[PDB]
Design a protein around this ligand. Sequence first.
Ligand SMILES: [Zn+2]
Ligand SMILES: [Zn+2]
Lengths: 36, 36
Amino acid sequence: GPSQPTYPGDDAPVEDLIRFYDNLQQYLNVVTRHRY
Amino acid sequence: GPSQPTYPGDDAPVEDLIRFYDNLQQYLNVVTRHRY
Ligand SMILES: [Zn+2]
Ligand SMILES: [Zn+2]
């Protein structure tokens, strides 16, 4: 599946923590085999 | 609102990245004033 996303830092702007959030969501669906 | 969650590490077990995911979700709803 997708490789594990890189955490952008505590001080990353909110738009970068929303991109990271969406990529962790993808990753977690794939690891748990639950692509809903 | 809630204080910014601590990232558990790249090597944290999947259940700990699902807890972090849920707490970042909370945090991001509050920062964006969109508590749906
Ligand atoms: Zn792969
Ligand atoms: Zn507060």
